[PDB]
Write a protein that binds this ligand. Structure first.
Ligand SMILES: [Mg+2]
Ligand SMILES: [Mg+2]
Ligand SMILES: [Mg+2]
Ligand SMILES: [Mg+2]
Ligand SMILES: [Mg+2]
Ligand SMILES: [Mg+2]
Ligand SMILES: [Mg+2]
Ligand SMILES: [Mg+2]
Ligand SMILES: [Mg+2]
Ligand SMILES: [Mg+2]
Ligand SMILES: [Mg+2]
Ligand SMILES: [Mg+2]
Ligand SMILES: [Mg+2]
Ligand SMILES: [Mg+2]
Ligand SMILES: [Mg+2]
Ligand SMILES: [Mg+2]
Ligand SMILES: [Mg+2]
Ligand SMILES: [Mg+2]
Ligand SMILES: [Mg+2]
Ligand SMILES: [Mg+2]
Lengths: 109, 338, 114
RNA sequence: UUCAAAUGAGAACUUUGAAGACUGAAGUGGGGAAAGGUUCCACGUCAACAGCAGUUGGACGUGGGUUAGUCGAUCCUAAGA
RNA sequence: UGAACAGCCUCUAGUUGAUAGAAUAAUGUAGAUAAGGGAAGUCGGCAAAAUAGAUCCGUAACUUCGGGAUAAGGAUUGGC
RNA sequence: UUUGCUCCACACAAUAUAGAUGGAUACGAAUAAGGCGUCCUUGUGGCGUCGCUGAACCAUAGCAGGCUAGCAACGGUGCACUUGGCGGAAAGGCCUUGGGUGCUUGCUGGCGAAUUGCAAUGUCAUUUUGCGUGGGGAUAAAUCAUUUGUAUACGACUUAGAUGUACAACGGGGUAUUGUAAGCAGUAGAGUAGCCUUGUUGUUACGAUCUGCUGAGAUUAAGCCUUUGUUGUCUGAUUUGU
């Protein structure tokens, strides 16, 4: 209902990158994450945190992690909003393991 | 078509070296839940061929068969057959007149049946609708049979029996565009060949100054209609029957479903047909099983088949256990606890 | 100008199989459409009735470059520029010669069917 | 190759940061000889040019820049002229 | 690392330039694998495969006595 | 989605015509045989008659066919209203029943016609369509976009999606692959170098490896199966009318 919302998801990048050319595993993972955010938040504008880009590229172009824990926050697009007034911001969640976790609505309000 | 598995049976063929000996045979399992009769079609003979005269439908049609009449079901108002169902208002006089027209005319009678795809582990939800010819009895008796069978189900045991020779009609597995080497089986050209060796070297003489229709050329491979014949039924299994996969020699309570389910299909919850060998089409594909067009007395037909054992090991790998109980007995206690 | 271009489902609404998405052409055309709309507003025309009554693309003079080919050869490498013009307009909403016979017949009909 | 920010009417390609890579010292480093001739550098700037693009550029416009008793030439002779 | 200015990886320095996005039909180009057979292929073993470093054994015909020769043919190799 | 769509009737306008100008007038067979009528004992029967072309038969008279008066018979034809019966080869037509309502040239009268000027198709049919009038009737879909992979170069195909055996993303379980994770510990370990009160499995340091927790850990649909869990999603665009 309310448009500004933050949830933590686990994305399965292994099944999304299955059989992808090695020199484009990490770029494809970036686009896969943007598609994942658009699916879950309905926002065409998706912005990736640079520390998330670091997490994606941590083991090179070829060694993207099988699973990734993401904090996706749909926020109001202020300061001359684009075609849509909402955008998704994707951040890495510091976890020892990305296994066994379910989608949780996180609120710090 | 659900998948394929393996059986062991005694061979009964006097004069054969394997007479009264066990043979291992591949079989194809077809998931066959009962079909729903929802209409009848009358066919008249004409000097231009067989012509449909009229179609009479049942009063009530389920959503799974009404989906077949829609390209965008979720968006539609679902008006199909709503005004037709009003012909059953006072006494079904219009329905009776149409059935009388079929009885009077219509040298050929066919019923309309649809699958209960909701009883299969398919995501489709849209039932398949087909015409099936009725054989036996006069035309009036055929029309009557359809009349009392409207909106009723017909199980596969009332159509097919053990040891019967049947025919499989299905569209084969598609492979898209294919070269001549695998589409037609032509010889590969030598390694030294410039500009490609998976080709036919000469596609025609100088005359006729055209490429002949009979030359092997690249194109669509697979997704063709095929009518394969003479497949012997090995088991008419019942869905409401524990120990579907068990025989009189085995007596281990297990269904026909392999461990982990049929790969890419799921589990067999319904009645099913087990036929010797393989049939055209891939798993999940709709297939039509037809009774034999001729009487077969080849002694390979009319040979009673008694299964001794059905393989239910997992087909998702080199499955080496038939049941979870057998796996637990062999392996013992694991770190996982139940 | 469509020979050996690809096919798409998005041409169904126009009854064709060959359709594309020429972004630069679209941007130039919508720039000129914005100009025509602004001209109509300056003239005082009603914006809701406006429709593209005339649109016409002509070949502008070609702009030359050279491309280099095998065996030390040189070919033309030309742009095909455009002149575009468009006009938006507002929507808006017997002597008889009869011969003598013909006249006499008509008179006879008049005095017979009265 | 990727993410973000800045700039900009406009950014896959400009700038900065972050990351991932490569050349791996008979280098994708640092200098020179022949040759080129201002291409060096700055400011402005994008009509044309740059295998797309371009806010960038060996482009375009305007300027600035090459300091010797000791480094060379200049002198000597070589095959030669 | 290694015999090594070989190949492979890294530091200083430099670059990240070569139109891009999407999808993985046929036929290609480049790189590969293959049951059993093993040149039956083909003008022709073309192409490919097999061999390969080092240590220790063991090396024939012939010879201009210098060679042939790494002939042929075998064994060993890590870590601690 | 403009008061849209559809059927019926009449009014106008347009459109065209492979070509109205009294009637396409229905047995089946044989042809070295038949048709029709008749009779009988019902037949491959007797008798008679016919053809030798449809040159027939039926329709045919009236200002392109008007108005009006009778006579004679109760017939013939048209129009709706009708009672049914039959016809599926492409039936869409055929046979009927009963009244009404016109016409009747079956037979006798009376009035009209002219000048289209001595001919000029001299316009009399019938596909189709639109705009109107007044009377009934009904109240959807398809495509794009998204989605699946039983499909696939692209088109195409095959699936799903407006509150549910709903779909999806995760999580759980099963299935499968590999082969025993990390960490901790050990009176395991060729030993070597120290330190002691030289234990009688003493301490310290280095030590491939070994053993236990541990058929463990990891991966598992990306074109595997399953799901009483968690979190979400579910009216955007275009077009189509007899
Ligand atoms: Mg692959
Ligand atoms: Mg060649
Ligand atoms: Mg298998
Ligand atoms: Mg062409
Ligand atoms: Mg082409
Ligand atoms: Mg093309
Ligand atoms: Mg060139
Ligand atoms: Mg040249
Ligand atoms: Mg680039
Ligand atoms: Mg350019
Ligand atoms: Mg510069
Ligand atoms: Mg300059
Ligand atoms: Mg000097
Ligand atoms: Mg390259
Ligand atoms: Mg082989
Ligand atoms: Mg072998
Ligand atoms: Mg040969
Ligand atoms: Mg030879
Ligand atoms: Mg060779
Ligand atoms: Mg020799």
């Amino acid at each position: 209902l309310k448009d500004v919302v933050t949830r933590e998801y686990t994305i399965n990048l292994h099944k999304r990158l299955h059989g992808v050319s090695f020199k484009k595993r990490a770029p494809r993972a970036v686009k896969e994450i943007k598609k994942f955010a658009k699916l879950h938040m309905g926002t065409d504008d998706v912005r990736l945190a640079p520390e998330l880009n670091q997490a994606i590229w941590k083991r090179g172009v070829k060694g993207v992690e099988y699973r990734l824990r993401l904090r996706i926050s749909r926020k109001r697009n202020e300061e001359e909003d684009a075609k849509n007034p909402l955008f998704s911001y994707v951040e890495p969640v510091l976890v020892a393991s990305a296994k066994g976790l379910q989608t949780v609505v996180v609120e710090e309000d | 078509k659900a998948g394929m598995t393996t059986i062991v049976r005694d061979l009964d063929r006097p004069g054969s070296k394997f007479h009264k000996r066990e043979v291992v045979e591949a079989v194809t399992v077809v998931d066959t839940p009962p079909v729903v009769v929802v209409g009848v079609v009358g066919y008249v003979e004409t000097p231009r061929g067989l012509r449909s005269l009229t179609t009479v439908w049942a009063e009530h049609l389920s959503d799974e068969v009404k989906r077949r009449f829609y390209k965008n079901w979720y968006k539609s108002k679902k008006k199909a057959f709503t005004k037709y169902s009003a012909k059953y208002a006072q006494d079904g006089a219009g329905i009776e007149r149409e059935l009388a027209r079929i009885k009077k005319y219509a040298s050929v009678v066919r019923v309309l049946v649809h699958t209960q795809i909701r009883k299969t582990p398919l995501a489709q939800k849209k039932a398949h609708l087909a015409e099936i010819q009725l054989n036996g009895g006069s035309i009036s008796e055929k029309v009557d049979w359809a009349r009392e069978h409207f909106e009723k189900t017909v199980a596969v045991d009332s159509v097919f029996e053990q040891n019967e020779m049947i025919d499989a009609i299905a569209v084969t597995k598609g492979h898209g565009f294919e070269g001549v080497t695998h589409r037609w089986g032509t010889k590969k050209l030598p390694r030294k060949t410039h500009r490609g060796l998976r080709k036919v070297a000469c596609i025609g003489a100088w005359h006729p100054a055209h490429v002949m229709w009979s030359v092997a050329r690249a194109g669509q491979r697979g997704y063709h209609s095929r009518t394969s014949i003479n497949h012997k039924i090995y088991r008419v299994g019942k869905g409401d029957d524990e120990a579907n996969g068990a025989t009189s020699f085995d007596r281990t309570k297990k269904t026909i479903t392999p461990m982990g389910g049929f790969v890419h299909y799921g589990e067999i919850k319904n009645d099913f047909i087990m036929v010797k060998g393989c049939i055209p089409g891939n798993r999940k594909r709709i297939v039509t099983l037809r009774k034999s067009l001729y009487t077969n007395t080849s002694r390979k037909a009319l040979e009673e088949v008694s299964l001794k054992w059905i393989d239910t090991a997992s087909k998702f790998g080199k499955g080496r256990f038939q049941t979870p109980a057998e796996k637990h007995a062999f392996m013992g206690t694991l770190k996982k606890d139940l | 100008f469509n020979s050996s271009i690809g096919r798409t489902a998005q041409g169904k609404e126009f009854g064709v199989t060959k359709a594309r998405w020429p972004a630069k052409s679209v941007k130039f055309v919508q720039g000129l459409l914005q100009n025509a709309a602004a001209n109509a507003e300056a003239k005082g025309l009603d914006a809701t009735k406006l429709y593209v009554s005339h649109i016409q693309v002509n070949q502008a003079p070609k702009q030359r470059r050279r491309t280099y080919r095998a065996h030390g050869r040189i070919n033309k490498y030309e742009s095909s520029p455009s002149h575009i013009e468009l006009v938006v307009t507002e929507k808006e909403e017997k002597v008889v010669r009869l011969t003598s016979r013909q006249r006499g017949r008509i008179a006879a009909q008049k005095r017979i069917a009265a």
